[model samples]
Target chain A: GAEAAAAAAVTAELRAFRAAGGTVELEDLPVTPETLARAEAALARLPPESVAVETYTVPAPTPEAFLAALEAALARLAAEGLPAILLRVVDADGNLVGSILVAAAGPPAESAAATGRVLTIYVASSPEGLKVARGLAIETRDAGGLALAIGASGAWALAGLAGALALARRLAEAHGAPVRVVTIGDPANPTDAALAAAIRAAYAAALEH
Target chain B: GAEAAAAAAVTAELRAFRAAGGTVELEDLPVTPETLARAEAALARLPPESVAVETYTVPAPTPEAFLAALEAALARLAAEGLPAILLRVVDADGNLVGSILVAAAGPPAESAAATGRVLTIYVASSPEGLKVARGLAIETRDAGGLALAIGASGAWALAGLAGALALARRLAEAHGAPVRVVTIGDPANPTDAALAAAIRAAYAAALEH
Candidate 1:
């Protein structure tokens, strides 16, 4: 009975929130062939002058090779002083299955540090891939770069990762640096707490390092 | 990483416990149709004793009916002074999907008065259900009644819910009767810090009520 009441109360609260001019929007980004094709087309249309895409597949054998490849790519982007976004697909064993990382270095934003933000790092495969991409985003943010993420078909995973980043952001904000997230895919979807934490951690690490 | 570390620590602790000659038994209660029917027949052979069964359900509609049925059964069992153990089902909603409240005139045990034991509530349900039932049990404990729960499959949810319940129990033990759980579901897995705060608020309310 207590549990029932609690659920009812939460539901009521949300309903009230919606009734009070609050709008809730749902975006279904299933990893269907059509959606994947659309995402691919979008990436292809990116201005070659503004965005650079790097793709590589680590040979099977050692999983560390994939991690090394990622680290090397990130290191290269960091050396070039370019904010980069990475997308990768890995098998269940944390091995890199397929991956993509994008980097751009134009000029610092007039008001902020960078102009062209590391738009998005997308990965498809398993839940682990989402976590890996999320961690990398945090690392990039820590290195003084902007990062955004989109999940192909798994919005829940994205939400979970986003929640982590949000938590990281909160912790970072509590200390000093403030991390912000802009949801482009679904404005109605709140950032997942974990994803938020990761972002915040990245920012905090940047400040400390 | 935190979960993995915690699990490792728990495994080490269990190992040490076993090394100290402590007995550890693992029992698997078969709830198959045959077993359930056999148990029911055996139970029926007992004296005209009363029995209370509590069950939990999830996703809402199911719990409503389950709780109602349990209440009816408990009401019928009221005539017998020998209150049977309360059977509770912990469903997916983190609430008592169903429960039978057996009434007993005198305290069951010697510590009944001191410990404030009334009736033992048996928990049977999913993890969220178990958590809700457990929270209710703690509340029952505070209310001068004994509340007990039994089941499996809801360990993680139970742990978190138990943590919140423990917090509420502490407050009630120190202060007075707290409020009841207004919500009875998992607070979203990988609970956010904000969700934790919300849980605290609910716990405080439980204390207040």
Candidate 2:
């Protein structure tokens, strides 16, 4: 109920922000079942049924919180002496996704009034993306920031997703959020589907209790 | 010199406790550069050149500290619900060459006095090791701990390596310690030799001032 309320509350604010013709700058590509399918196809030649990739994305039920973290990461990494900021994102299920390294001066801030920008990092699909993401991670360490090294695997992905979810989950649990995992051989298999599912079921189970 | 003191201090206690033979149980395989080599060889047929693997390992000036971390990791994982401990052993250079997950239950303490054991995690070489490593990682999460989901890749190794280093780096920095890094991909390129070298040299250059 708390999450539902938080979700609804944030949803309304987001709607209004957009209704006001606000704009957003997403730092990375979005994911869905389709994303999973694409990953499977890429690794299909030598891969198993399920292929997991490592990445980090910041998700917040509240756009305000998401933007705050985004701005913080950007600034922390970009400041003089250029230190690195490595923040852990823990998803609701307790999986810690690997990277949320906010480093390198972000593209010149177009406007301070910008609506929340979702900061997302996924398996480097392009050489440029990989170079930039990997560079940021290494540079963060070089700058005395945490080096999480996301090299495109689900272990990295699993850790990163779990970590990312925790922020929202913390938000959701305190009332911030969720992944699908499957297994073995021919296609893309996600890990711990039921672990995540059971948590969902627990919410329902909690209500019954 | 500070790291030496920290090393000595940690070593002394580790020795005294060890002379007393304070025993500990351990579970998991050891990984190292040698491990990486084997992994490379195994996947060489199915692989890409200069393909980097993710891993972690903890090495102490004294073999004693190494075993201590091993024991602590084991009991920590073995306690309570018996969660598994995943640690990557990173050598002088930043590349984490060894140690993964130690889990389930140890055979026995054998004795209270135990020398330090190197902790390492890596790719699936033999079927049994793969089966066991994957099992522990998945099981640990299943029992509500960190899965760390190695999923049979150097990827698992890479992230684990980065996480372990941060912990040690955090501790070492408080007391002041340093590690070397290399760069340039000529022979067998291990990730970012060039990035690490540049950073280390820059750090040294800063100290000159």
Candidate 3:
């Protein structure tokens, strides 16, 4: 099984690293047992990575404009109906950086109180009105250009956008070559852009601003 | 072979997409035998994608101070050797991006020139760099504070640090989390502080400037 192979191959590498003079902290460091267990138990336990996510992406000529356009789209979509918006600024290096999300969510006293972690990060966007403004509200210290993402909830969108932007930026900054977006998709309608287009059209309303 | 598996998985995904009514652009979509042939050549050639990556972590209570420490360390270890300084900068979401490479043997200008890829990222280290400077020189964008890696040419040090900073920035910004470097190493040492400390010691020499 590919699963077995994944574990075996990883185990061998661990052994080799040790044999080669390199050290492994986990002895396990997610060694065979931890990996196999995690892989095996993935269907069952370890209930929290502490985040939920979904992502939608659009490519743009200049990414900063992409953020501005998306933010406008979110403003328009708000009129049409949409969910919570959460965000942060990424840099040329793709560091999501700062208290952009939880701050935007502005969780009430109770929500904040429940998770010590939440209280720790629910910081406000000093610029761009970054909290759940609904589309793409980048603080823009710099991420080559502001990259954006949209998701279902404040936290969910936060996780998805953050993850996607990091990966996308890596692909973009890879080896100093600006790569084209070769493949992209819409989870809502991978069938065609026609449907996604309608949604885009609705969101496009934001571009008018 | 993983190659076979990859082609199969990709074909399956594409088929699933088509079945659902989505469209794929074919300008160079790997839709034909010519594309399939390239995939084949990779087997006898490029081969598989095995090998595990050992990601070392470094903390930066004050990345400014960390950088100073590191620069000094590198100045110290100008000889007797080092390997690829491959690094992983923990992103907000914890993804490592960017590249810095310095090798014991060094790379050729031909390999460097091959892709016109070396047009130059023309990066700057506002706080810390994460982009390329020919073989290496980073923007110092802002990683948690400190980071580490092993790989490439004498310049490998450059690429490795740049890459780590971008990812570190990503992690720092992800959720307003302050990350700590965990589990990292080179070919010879394994203990966390030992190798990273040794490296910190090497580059720390640079801080004197």
Candidate 4:
């Protein structure tokens, strides 16, 4: 197949790159057959730390899909564990734009006077996608949500990432909510389920740290 | 701008998701103007540790572009520091399909008798993209390169990511090379430049570790 040939071509270029002193070191994993086992094995190799992880998949990126994913994540938060929602994004015409798989896990919202008071907002995406995150911040504030911890990952979209970080710091300072922000992952190609697994794994690592 | 309205809509939908029990936690950064400063500041906040990071950009996804990026990364790797390549991928017709920002940094190759001996290989990308990575492994082995370290990132493309990981494992077992694999970032909509910064930052952090 053409795939086989192209793969060979790719390896050839990489070898040449190596011969010239460039790294063959990888920041991300390749797509292959035994990905899950490798991932699970990595997880298992980590020290014995229990991080409750839950995942949800939204069928589409529409309001209804978001609503359904939200509902599912909350159901688990109320009953079981910290949850991650896996959803796809599409353009207005339903063309696949990208996908999002995110997890929100922190100290349980205790039985306070305002139990539903939102604390942290973490938004990540491309520059255009950050516009959506800003929208989230404004909407959350208007709805009486507190901006405690805000973070975004724009992959390589620096402006969007910076905007998200600044917003997080500003909101954290304004509200005195602890904030953590960092750039992780690519924002363009969002359909890889491994990204979801990585997100879940990150939450576990942070909790462990 | 349309961005404002869309952002608000995003927030509103997110609020409803919150009300329904979803976490507003994010896994990626948004695009905005203040990105680089924020990134630099984050780097500054880290303790006194040095990680040599360099980056290269390729104009297109053709073999010529790949060679240019490879040449630049290696030039620096030979003379200066650990280098990362920032480049775009295109379909046969030249439409932007995705991007790759990667670094290959490891222990220095001393001026030994076989100073040019190649070892380690890491590949990352979408499943379709991982096809390219597999091409790399086969090509490198034939050219006398050892698969010492292999990793890949396919964003959300699980099948591709999985395939890459499996190949790395298979190669590593056969060659007794160390391997690491993980999934991160989105693979679609890759016009963002922030992913480049993050990759550089990760190399720094790894060296610090």
Q: Report clashes for each candidate as comma-separated counts.
A: 58, 71, 69, 57
- Model 3: what TM-score for its first chain? 0.18
Judging by lDDT against the true structure, name the best candidate.
1
Per-candidate interface C-alpha RMSD? 19.6, 24.6, 24.1, 14.8
TM-score of each: 0.25, 0.21, 0.18, 0.25
Question: Where in model 2 is the C-alpha error above 4 Å?
Answer: A2-6, A22-66, A81-84, A89-99, A103-107, A110-209, B1-209
Candidate 2: tens digits of C-alpha lDDT, residues B90-203: 766766444545433232121111212211222232333443344434433333333232222232232332333332332232322221111111111122222122222222
- Per-residue lDDT over A1-209 for candidate 4, one digit per residue giving the tens place of the 0 to 100 score: 42233223323332333334322221222222243343244334321144343333423223233334444544555465433333344445655443433333332232111324223333334433333333333333334443211122222122222222233332233332332332222222242222222332222222221
As a whole number from 0 to 100, the lDDT of residue B155 in candidate 2 is 28
Candidate DockQ values, in order, are: 0.01, 0.01, 0.03, 0.03
The TM-score obtained by chain A of candidate 4 when compared with the true chain A: 0.27
Candidate 3 has an lDDT of 0.26
Cα lDDT, model 4, residue B36:
30
Count: clashes, candidate 3: 69
RMSD (Cα, Å) of model 3: 25.0
For model 1, residues B1-209, the per-residue Cα lDDT tens digits are: 43333223323322332334321111112122333444345345332244444443433322224334434433444544433445454546566533333333334332244443223433333444334444444444444553444332223222323322332232233222322222222212222212222322222222221
